[PDB]
Motif scaffolding. Structure first.
Motif, mmCIF file in Angstrom:
data_model
loop_
_atom_site.group_PDB
_atom_site.id
_atom_site.type_symbol
_atom_site.label_atom_id
_atom_site.label_comp_id
_atom_site.label_asym_id
_atom_site.label_seq_id
_atom_site.Cartn_x
_atom_site.Cartn_y
_atom_site.Cartn_z
ATOM 1 N N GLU B 17 36.129 40.734 23.014
ATOM 2 C CA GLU B 17 37.403 40.824 23.724
ATOM 3 C C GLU B 17 37.193 41.276 25.174
ATOM 4 O O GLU B 17 37.729 40.658 26.116
ATOM 5 N N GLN B 18 36.386 42.318 25.388
ATOM 6 C CA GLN B 18 36.150 42.782 26.756
ATOM 7 C C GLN B 18 35.519 41.713 27.622
ATOM 8 O O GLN B 18 35.797 41.648 28.838
ATOM 9 N N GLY C 56 29.815 29.597 34.596
ATOM 10 C CA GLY C 56 30.503 30.682 35.263
ATOM 11 C C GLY C 56 31.166 31.618 34.267
ATOM 12 O O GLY C 56 31.139 32.849 34.444
ATOM 13 N N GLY C 57 31.713 31.078 33.177
ATOM 14 C CA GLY C 57 32.291 31.947 32.164
ATOM 15 C C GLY C 57 31.203 32.716 31.436
ATOM 16 O O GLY C 57 31.387 33.893 31.086
ATOM 17 N N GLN C 58 30.058 32.072 31.179
ATOM 18 C CA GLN C 58 28.958 32.783 30.535
ATOM 19 C C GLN C 58 28.440 33.911 31.412
ATOM 20 O O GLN C 58 28.134 34.999 30.908
ATOM 21 N N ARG C 59 28.300 33.664 32.704
ATOM 22 C CA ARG C 59 27.803 34.687 33.613
ATOM 23 C C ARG C 59 28.765 35.856 33.669
ATOM 24 O O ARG C 59 28.344 37.020 33.699
ATOM 25 N N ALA C 60 30.058 35.580 33.718
ATOM 26 C CA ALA C 60 31.024 36.665 33.773
ATOM 27 C C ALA C 60 30.933 37.500 32.506
ATOM 28 O O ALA C 60 30.992 38.737 32.569
ATOM 29 N N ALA C 61 30.776 36.864 31.351
ATOM 30 C CA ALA C 61 30.665 37.606 30.097
ATOM 31 C C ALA C 61 29.368 38.405 30.051
ATOM 32 O O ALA C 61 29.349 39.587 29.636
ATOM 33 N N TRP C 62 28.262 37.804 30.495
ATOM 34 C CA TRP C 62 26.985 38.498 30.534
ATOM 35 C C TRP C 62 27.065 39.723 31.422
ATOM 36 O O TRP C 62 26.525 40.774 31.061
ATOM 37 N N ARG C 63 27.783 39.647 32.541
ATOM 38 C CA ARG C 63 27.875 40.801 33.429
ATOM 39 C C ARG C 63 28.682 41.905 32.792
ATOM 40 O O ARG C 63 28.304 43.078 32.897
ATOM 41 N N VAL C 64 29.746 41.567 32.064
ATOM 42 C CA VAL C 64 30.522 42.592 31.360
ATOM 43 C C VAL C 64 29.656 43.297 30.334
ATOM 44 O O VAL C 64 29.614 44.546 30.257
ATOM 45 N N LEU C 65 28.948 42.522 29.536
ATOM 46 C CA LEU C 65 28.109 43.080 28.477
ATOM 47 C C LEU C 65 26.936 43.866 29.047
ATOM 48 O O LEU C 65 26.582 44.932 28.515
#
Ligand SMILES: *Cc1ccc(S(=O)(=O)N2CCCCC2)cc1
Ligand SMILES: *Cc1ccc(S(=O)(=O)N2CCCCC2)cc1
Ligand SMILES: [Cl-]
Ligand SMILES: [Cl-]
Lengths: 9, 228, 228, 9
Positions: B17-18, C56-65
């Motif tokens: 979710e985050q 771009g969506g994968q990179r944004a998720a990777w940066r959050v994680l």
């Protein structure tokens, strides 16, 4: 017409 | 997800979710449901958020494609691709309905859990109804109606009129009446009665509960403003 | 997508873009590339848009994680899930790089196509470099640098300084220098020289070309403002 | 630092 957004916990 | 611990699936659903990774979040929560234990309140919300986001993106895409297809009917590619998105959407709705039927609803005895799951059942049949064409549309519409009605009956007996689940159920059932069942007057009457009965119960609430209930009341009012 | 016509894949990629279904769009454009014919300008843009949105969506998720994981290092689930997203991102970058190597670059003889594909090659190695750790980071960084440098050399010989591909290449190579290669002074010098040489060539452009070129110039200026 | 958005054809 809007239902519950319900997209965020 | 059979080899991953329940608690790890729940932790990963919160991370997904985050990260705005809602497909992953739904897969983690499906794995958690399939462990066979009942879900807590927070876990029910994670399940619902995950699938609402997945199916919400599918519905938005289906509406774009359906609009292009209708304009083109005023090669086969637009219809083929709308059909592909439609089949994927139906598959997600069938997956959620299958979780509810195996075995979340039958094990849900408290009003809060049983109403929550029956509202979800109404919602996912409603999403099936949005894309259904013909006589099978009728049975799908009746399945949504039946689920919402059972949830309404329990909620009116067991929850106060400001309970957020009761309010969100009434909101979504009113949308069902307006958008699916061709019953705008029923939609308006349900939204008005729900709003008025919640207003009269706000005095009983704490500041935080007041904020939760009034937020959903405003959604009911927003629909009444659009419909009247 | 081997059984679908090339023209149908291109049509569906355009529909998928309108529906914001970028994974589908990338799969349609991969199928189109694998037909073996060269891509037109518009088709190259569809390929690039599709994969840029997916990664771009994968990179944004990777940066959050990655941010959550770093805070936790100040159970295994956060690292496991960051690793899962990272592996998926690497797989998409490897897929794009494989399309470029089999056989888009080798068949690209015009400057506009060859520069476009070499810029993409630099970009997808740059995304690999963002998640790479150690000595393999060095070889990945050099692969990005080499692709960007070959594209720069061709663009400076064959395109005017306002050409939007030349400008976007210089923008992204400057980001590479600043963010990946630890060369902020090289990033700033490249962005400044690129901006100034484009400014001096704007007088040659039509109104519509002027709008295209000045939009990218503003991005160069936005980075210079952040970096100085 | 922003690269080409490049998210819209
Ligand atoms: C059906 C339903 C789901 C959630 C809620 S809520 O927890 O009160 N909330 C979540 C979405 C944002 C607004 C309200 C209520 C009903
Ligand atoms: C690398 C690159 C891609 C696209 C362009 S553009 O076609 O001029 N355009 C697309 C994104 C929005 C702004 C500019 C330029 C360079
Ligand atoms: Cl129970
Ligand atoms: Cl060629």
């Amino acid at each position: 017409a809007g239902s519950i957004p319900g997209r965020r916990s | 997800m059979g080899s991953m611990e329940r608690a790890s699936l729940i932790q990963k659903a919160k991370l997904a979710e985050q990260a705005e990774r809602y497909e992953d979040m739904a897969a983690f929560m499906k794995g958690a449901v399939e462990k066979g234990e009942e879900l807590s309140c927070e876990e029910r919300n994670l399940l619902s958020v995950a699938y609402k986001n997945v199916v919400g993106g599918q519905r938005a895409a289906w509406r774009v494609l359906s609009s292009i297809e209708q304009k083109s009917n005023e090669g086969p590619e637009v219809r083929e691709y709308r059909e592909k998105v439609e089949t994927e959407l139906q598959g997600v709705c069938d997956t959620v309905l299958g979780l509810l039927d195996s075995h979340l609803i039958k094990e849900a005895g408290d009003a809060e859990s049983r109403v929550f799951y029956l509202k979800m059942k109404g919602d996912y049949y409603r999403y099936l109804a949005e894309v259904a064409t013909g006589d099978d549309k009728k049975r799908i519409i009746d399945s949504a109606r039946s689920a919402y009605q059972e949830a309404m009956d329990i909620s009116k007996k067991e929850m106060p009129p400001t309970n957020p689940i009761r309010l969100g159920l009434a909101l979504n059932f009113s949308v069902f009446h307006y958008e699916i069942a061709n019953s705008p007057e029923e939609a308006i009457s349900l939204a008005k009665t729900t709003f008025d009965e919640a207003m009269a119960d706000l005095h009983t609430l704490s500041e935080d509960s007041y904020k939760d209930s009034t937020l959903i009341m405003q959604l009911l009012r927003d629909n009444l403003t659009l419909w009247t």
